[PDB]
């Protein structure tokens, strides 16, 4: 059954490729003052969970849903801009750059983990295609 | 593999010391203030086996 | 239903798979949004692997054809 | 159990909590 | 009959390296997910039994009838997984290499067949 | 689904 | 139950 | 056209550079008297947006106006 | 489903058997022509 | 011939990579020139056509006073995503070709 | 419309008076 | 060679231990207190020879973490809860350079081991193809 | 046996 | 005794004294 390890390392690289650009979306807007509603940008992060069915064993990882971030909010001072709060507090996104920055690196790593599994598989199938020639 | 998630945690705390410190400065002016005190709490994380 | 309508069949399910993987191919190389390069390159590998398949069942097979003209009667 | 070993029974959950 | 028997070890032993592979490739696709405990098999038990008792299946969403054991952490991680990436990946390699060597010994002894019979 | 990949061709058509 | 990865979830998070 | 991190973090780079063009272009004009017309110079702000393409779920960094 | 282990296992212990029936055969067939092309 | 219609749709993406890595690598050079409009070709269109070049302005971002309207890090991603691009096409191509080859093989 | 999307037309020239023709 | 493979997998282990607690060592350099209102000892790992069954060689394996007994050091802030009857807070004795060194070292042994596993397996999938 | 590698045991220590 | 070489004895155990006595 290598087969199904097509899968598992599939749904891998897609969550953490789904991962490493919610980090980048957030990084990109640890400035914004401004949402298209006008709202402050919450910053966001992924939820993963095991890709498993009721009743299978283990599979690969899935991206349940995309949730904002849990951190107070930048309060800034500037009653000036236009966007301010009524005693002037303009709120910025809650975005820590450390994390992530550590996060876009982690998410790189673990999907060029998981395209190093794919390549020993399709080698190994290969090699197990030539079994008795 | 996760001692990258160690030396994050240590430099975020760094900055929000380094923010408390800052705001502590920002208020050298202010009457009758009184500074905030920081102190880098070390948490021993529990499990297995080492 | 018979041997013939097995093989059949089962070259039939490789060519979709194949086409399946061009197509998508086809539709990241030519921007449209939603396709990713991730799930190209693993269609892409997953039809290589299924055409090497095809090939080593096709190779048996005409090797066993060819030592069963052999017998002599 | 050694660690790389093998068990049958899960590793308790761990929790690195602030103050007692 | 006779030669099913000849060539069922090698094979068993193949299928049940194939199961240990995607049972690794699934710790290492998960390394990063909160709260997840590291699963491997014992490989001479679990082939024994499969070689004394046919292979069985929970359904048939289907999977083996394999005893999945938790692996023994190393080190406490806050998020809660056990998924040590050194032993992952060493043991990715050996079961790399002992179903190669498995792939080998069998290719070798059918050929070992096919040159009795061949004429 | 809700959140196109990284690698991805742009959500913006 | 997963999770979020990563950074919130290695970080000492609030008791309750 | 662009892939989506390309596009995210280009638009990045972007917004950072109209940014400091802006301040730049305060710190010149810090003593000026008068424009071309008569007018004093008017500090410039600039305000990011998020380019939400999708639903709520992510996006770039774009500049409506000056 | 059915993999690749199975699938080329169970292909060349077809091979092979039915390769193993083909010389059979070939024994018995050239042992009869050899007994009917006696002279008595 | 159907040898030509199989690789028709991956040699024509192929040649207008190139062709459009030649444009932003025109428009990197001439950054420095007074004048200069930053040309750029739409890459679906284009292909729809070949399969089935004009070259358009691009909208200027920042107004300069030399009348150069070529964006430094607008091109620099167009060009590092046009030679990724070129070498999944390249990648594709030859993918397609070692699998007519092995078919053959025997 | 969007910095950096494509158009058919040039920009126009980008002059810049020093006093109010 | 299946053993080399025990031994490299057990001295990745050992020194991705020893990165870890040097790390940790790092980040706690100016905590003054943990959960219970101890200060923080600093931690060292302790190597010993894995060869139960295998002579007198054999892989590496971290026997236990001990807390480092160089004496703690000691700053005088009378106003501290945590000081004591004569004013001074025990601070950790973790040594920034020995750190340092120590992270430096376990990442070269880390990458010797992981060249030295790679060159075994290699040699491994060619003794495969003895005879052919 | 073995002791603590690196830097605790590569240092002067007083002699015990 | 060559270094590099084999030797049956082990080595002897290395010391460092501050003092001499």
Same mark, same amino acid.
């Given at each position: $059954? %290598? %087969?199904?390890?097509?899968?598992?390392?599939?749904?891998?690289?897609?969550?953490?490729?789904?991962?490493?650009?919610?980090?980048?979306?957030?990084?990109?807007?640890?400035?914004?003052?401004?949402?298209?509603?006008?709202?402050?940008?919450?910053?966001?992060?992924?939820?993963?969970?095991?890709?498993?069915?009721?009743?299978? $064993?283990?599979?690969?990882?899935?991206?349940?849903?995309?949730? &904002?971030?849990?951190?107070?909010?930048?309060?800034?001072? &500037?009653?000036?801009?236009? %966007?301010?709060?009524?005693?002037?507090?303009?709120?910025?996104?809650?975005?820590?750059?450390?994390? &992530?920055?550590?996060?876009?690196?982690?998410?790189?790593?673990?999907?060029?983990?998981?395209?190093?599994?794919?390549?020993?598989?399709?080698?190994?199938?290969?090699?197990?295609?030539?079994?008795?020639? | 593999?996760?001692?990258?998630?160690?030396?994050?945690?240590?430099?975020? +705390?760094?900055?929000? +010391? +380094?923010?408390?410190?800052?705001?502590?400065?920002?208020?050298?002016?202010?009457?009758?203030?009184?500074? +905030?005190?920081?102190?880098?709490?070390?948490?021993?994380?529990?499990?297995?086996?080492? | 239903?018979?041997?013939?309508? !097995?093989?059949?069949?089962?070259?039939?399910?490789?060519?979709?798979?194949?086409?399946?993987?061009?197509?998508?191919?086809?539709?990241?190389?030519?921007?449209?949004?939603?396709?990713?390069?991730?799930?190209? /390159?693993?269609?892409? !590998?997953?039809?290589?692997?299924?055409?090497? /398949?095809?090939?080593?069942?096709?190779?048996?097979?005409?090797?066993?054809?060819?030592?069963?003209?052999? /017998?002599?009667? | 159990?050694?660690?790389?070993?093998?068990?049958?029974?899960?590793?308790?959950?761990?929790?690195?909590?602030?103050?007692? | 009959?006779?030669?099913?028997?000849?060539?069922?070890?090698?094979?068993?032993?193949? *299928?049940?390296?194939?199961?240990?592979?995607?049972?690794?490739?699934?710790?290492?696709?998960?390394?990063? @997910?909160?709260?997840?405990?590291?699963?491997?098999?014992?490989?001479? #038990?679990?082939?024994?039994?499969?070689?004394?008792?046919?292979?069985?299946? @929970?359904?048939?969403?289907? #999977?083996?009838?394999?005893?999945?054991?938790?692996?023994?952490?190393?080190?406490?991680?806050?998020?809660? *997984? @056990?998924?040590?990436?050194?032993?992952?990946?060493?043991?990715?390699?050996? *079961?790399?290499?002992?179903?190669?060597?498995?792939? @080998?010994?069998?290719? #070798?002894?059918?050929?070992?067949?096919?040159?009795?019979?061949?004429?």
């Amino acid at each position: $059954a %290598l %087969l199904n390890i097509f899968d598992i390392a599939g749904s891998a690289l897609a969550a953490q490729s789904k991962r490493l650009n919610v980090a980048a979306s957030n990084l990109a807007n640890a400035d914004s003052v401004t949402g298209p509603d006008g709202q402050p940008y919450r910053a966001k992060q992924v939820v993963f969970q095991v890709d498993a069915a009721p009743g299978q $064993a283990t599979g690969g990882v899935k991206v349940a849903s995309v949730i &904002e971030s849990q951190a107070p909010e930048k309060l800034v001072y &500037e009653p000036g801009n236009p %966007l301010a709060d009524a005693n002037g507090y303009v709120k910025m996104p809650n975005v820590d750059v450390v994390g &992530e920055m550590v996060n876009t690196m982690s998410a790189s790593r673990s999907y060029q983990a998981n395209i190093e599994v794919l390549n020993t598989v399709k080698s190994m199938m290969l090699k197990t295609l030539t079994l008795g020639q | 593999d996760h001692a990258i998630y160690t030396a994050m945690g240590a430099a975020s +705390q760094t900055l929000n +010391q +380094q923010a408390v410190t800052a705001s502590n400065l920002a208020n050298a002016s202010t009457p009758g203030f009184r500074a +905030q005190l920081n102190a880098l709490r070390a948490v021993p994380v529990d499990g297995l086996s080492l | 239903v018979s041997f013939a309508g !097995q093989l059949h069949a089962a070259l039939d399910r490789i060519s979709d798979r194949q086409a399946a993987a061009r197509v998508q191919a086809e539709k990241f190389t030519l921007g449209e949004p939603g396709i990713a390069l991730n799930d190209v /390159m693993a269609d892409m !590998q997953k039809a290589s692997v299924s055409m090497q /398949m095809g090939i080593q069942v096709r190779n048996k097979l005409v090797a066993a054809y060819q030592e069963v003209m052999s /017998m002599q009667v | 159990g050694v660690p790389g070993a093998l068990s049958n029974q899960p590793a308790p959950p761990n929790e690195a909590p602030i103050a007692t | 009959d006779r030669l099913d028997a000849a060539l069922r070890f090698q094979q068993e032993a193949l *299928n049940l390296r194939a199961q240990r592979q995607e049972i690794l490739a699934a710790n290492i696709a998960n390394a990063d @997910t909160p709260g997840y405990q590291a699963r491997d098999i014992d490989f001479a #038990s679990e082939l024994k039994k499969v070689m004394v008792r046919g292979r069985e299946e @929970t359904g048939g969403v289907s #999977s083996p009838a394999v005893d999945l054991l938790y692996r023994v952490p190393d080190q406490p991680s806050l998020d809660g *997984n @056990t998924v040590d990436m050194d032993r992952e990946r060493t043991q990715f390699a050996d *079961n790399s290499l002992k179903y190669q060597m498995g792939l @080998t010994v069998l290719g #070798s002894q059918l050929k070992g067949m096919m040159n009795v019979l061949q004429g």
